[PDB]
Design a protein around this ligand. Structure first.
Ligand SMILES: CC(C)=CCC/C(C)=C/COP(=O)(O)O
Ligand SMILES: CC(C)=CCC/C(C)=C/COP(=O)(O)O
Ligand SMILES: CC(C)=CCC/C(C)=C/COP(=O)(O)O
Ligand SMILES: CC(C)=CCC/C(C)=C/COP(=O)(O)O
Ligand SMILES: CC(C)=CCC/C(C)=C/COP(=O)(O)O
Ligand SMILES: CC(C)=CCC/C(C)=C/COP(=O)(O)O
Ligand SMILES: CC(C)=CCC/C(C)=C/COP(=O)(O)O
Ligand SMILES: CC(C)=CCC/C(C)=C/COP(=O)(O)O
Ligand SMILES: CC(C)=CCC/C(C)=C/COP(=O)(O)O
Ligand SMILES: CC(C)=CCC/C(C)=C/COP(=O)(O)O
Ligand SMILES: CC(C)=CCC/C(C)=C/COP(=O)(O)O
Ligand SMILES: CC(C)=CCC/C(C)=C/COP(=O)(O)O
Ligand SMILES: [Ca+2]
Ligand SMILES: [Ca+2]
Ligand SMILES: [Ca+2]
Ligand SMILES: [Ca+2]
Ligand SMILES: [Ca+2]
Ligand SMILES: [Ca+2]
Ligand SMILES: [Ca+2]
Ligand SMILES: [Ca+2]
Ligand SMILES: [Ca+2]
Ligand SMILES: [Ca+2]
Ligand SMILES: [Ca+2]
Ligand SMILES: [Ca+2]
Ligand SMILES: [Ca+2]
Ligand SMILES: [Ca+2]
Ligand SMILES: [Ca+2]
Ligand SMILES: [Ca+2]
Ligand SMILES: [Ca+2]
Ligand SMILES: [Ca+2]
Ligand SMILES: [Ca+2]
Ligand SMILES: [Ca+2]
Ligand SMILES: [Ca+2]
Ligand SMILES: [Ca+2]
Ligand SMILES: [Ca+2]
Ligand SMILES: [Ca+2]
Ligand SMILES: [Ca+2]
Ligand SMILES: [Ca+2]
Ligand SMILES: [Ca+2]
Ligand SMILES: [Ca+2]
Ligand SMILES: [Ca+2]
Ligand SMILES: [Ca+2]
Ligand SMILES: [Ca+2]
Ligand SMILES: [Ca+2]
Ligand SMILES: [Ca+2]
Ligand SMILES: [Ca+2]
Ligand SMILES: [Ca+2]
Ligand SMILES: [Ca+2]
Ligand SMILES: [Ca+2]
Ligand SMILES: [Ca+2]
Ligand SMILES: [Ca+2]
Ligand SMILES: [Ca+2]
Ligand SMILES: [Ca+2]
Ligand SMILES: [Ca+2]
Ligand SMILES: [Cl-]
Ligand SMILES: [Cl-]
Ligand SMILES: [Cl-]
Ligand SMILES: [Cl-]
Ligand SMILES: [Cl-]
Ligand SMILES: [Cl-]
Ligand SMILES: [Cl-]
Ligand SMILES: [Cl-]
Ligand SMILES: [Cl-]
Ligand SMILES: [Cl-]
Ligand SMILES: [Cl-]
Ligand SMILES: [Cl-]
Ligand SMILES: [Cl-]
Ligand SMILES: [Cl-]
Ligand code: NA
Lengths: 12, 12, 12, 12, 12, 12, 12, 12, 12, 12, 12, 12
């Protein structure tokens, strides 16, 4: 996997 | 963004 | 399956 | 807005 | 989960 | 939380 | 179709 | 489990 | 054909 | 992703 | 172990 | 894909 600090998908 | 051919999240 | 809006596992 | 105690999005 | 037609978070 | 005896996610 | 939350085959 | 006479997955 | 270990289509 | 002009899976 | 960001089995 | 002689997941 996750990127973005917003979990899976959304921001990479 | 998407990777994986499974849409957002899931497989990168 | 999924619950929680966070994908598989994590919050049910 | 927010729900979830996780801020905007994520868990409602 | 989402509301708003603008994805996760932002407008409910 | 978990269900399925396979841990978090996967089988509920 | 699928059952199981593990995709085609495996758990019904 | 299997259905279909094609093994696990595929036709139920 | 299949790729991905998830059968036909889905992940290549 | 897809190949084949027949969508996901089927002909690669 | 796991691979794929889909948990145990599924995509390696 | 599988490894381990125990099918998808579990032992790699
Ligand atoms: C090189 C590839 C193909 C991906 C690595 C980065 C990554 C793990 C993205 C997934 O982030 P999200 O789950 O937030 O979309
Ligand atoms: C290196 C980073 C940070 C991302 C590039 C690849 C990417 C855009 C992955 C996101 O895929 P999903 O939406 O399928 O998780
Ligand atoms: C009552 C049982 C046994 C399952 C129904 C609810 C469900 C489908 C949970 C899975 O959620 P996560 O994949 O987010 O853990
Ligand atoms: C009437 C609607 C549609 C929402 C009520 C609760 C709410 C404001 C949800 C948004 O929570 P997140 O920002 O955590 O997604
Ligand atoms: C049960 C609660 C508290 C809210 C349901 C409405 C909902 C699912 C809003 C989340 O929308 P966004 O992801 O657009 O913030
Ligand atoms: C009624 C609800 C909403 C959940 C109860 C069952 C549950 C806790 C599912 C989570 O299972 P996994 O963690 O294996 O996905
Ligand atoms: C009535 C029949 C015969 C099947 C209904 C259940 C079904 C659609 C199962 C296939 O699940 P898997 O793809 O997970 O093996
Ligand atoms: C009631 C359910 C849930 C399924 C019963 C029949 C079954 C065991 C389907 C699995 O067949 P495949 O392995 O061929 O997909
Ligand atoms: C380079 C081409 C054109 C195909 C070879 C690899 C292949 C056979 C992919 C099909 O996988 P799925 O059936 O999992 O989508
Ligand atoms: C690297 C691999 C293994 C595949 C690339 C070509 C491809 C993306 C085929 C998938 O096509 P279908 O979705 O039509 O099966
Ligand atoms: C040495 C071997 C044979 C495995 C290394 C990679 C691995 C740990 C695959 C298991 O991933 P899944 O649980 O997603 O299948
Ligand atoms: C390319 C990678 C990383 C793994 C190769 C070995 C493999 C396909 C293991 C998956 O085994 P299980 O389905 O038992 O987890
Ligand atoms: Ca991810
Ligand atoms: Ca993310
Ligand atoms: Ca994170
Ligand atoms: Ca999100
Ligand atoms: Ca994405
Ligand atoms: Ca895509
Ligand atoms: Ca993906
Ligand atoms: Ca699930
Ligand atoms: Ca979801
Ligand atoms: Ca969840
Ligand atoms: Ca909000
Ligand atoms: Ca808050
Ligand atoms: Ca936000
Ligand atoms: Ca929230
Ligand atoms: Ca949401
Ligand atoms: Ca929204
Ligand atoms: Ca939407
Ligand atoms: Ca759980
Ligand atoms: Ca357990
Ligand atoms: Ca489980
Ligand atoms: Ca099936
Ligand atoms: Ca499914
Ligand atoms: Ca499987
Ligand atoms: Ca299944
Ligand atoms: Ca079966
Ligand atoms: Ca059979
Ligand atoms: Ca079958
Ligand atoms: Ca195929
Ligand atoms: Ca296969
Ligand atoms: Ca595939
Ligand atoms: Ca495809
Ligand atoms: Ca096409
Ligand atoms: Ca195709
Ligand atoms: Ca097919
Ligand atoms: Ca594993
Ligand atoms: Ca993982
Ligand atoms: Ca999973
Ligand atoms: Ca497992
Ligand atoms: Ca996996
Ligand atoms: Ca496997
Ligand atoms: Ca085997
Ligand atoms: Ca195994
Ligand atoms: Cl992250
Ligand atoms: Cl993709
Ligand atoms: Cl959900
Ligand atoms: Cl909150
Ligand atoms: Cl919406
Ligand atoms: Cl988000
Ligand atoms: Cl359990
Ligand atoms: Cl399912
Ligand atoms: Cl059969
Ligand atoms: Cl495969
Ligand atoms: Cl195509
Ligand atoms: Cl992983
Ligand atoms: Cl094996
Ligand atoms: Cl599995
Ligand atoms: Na948005």
């Amino acid at each position: 996997x996750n990127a973005x600090d917003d979990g899976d998908g959304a921001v990479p």
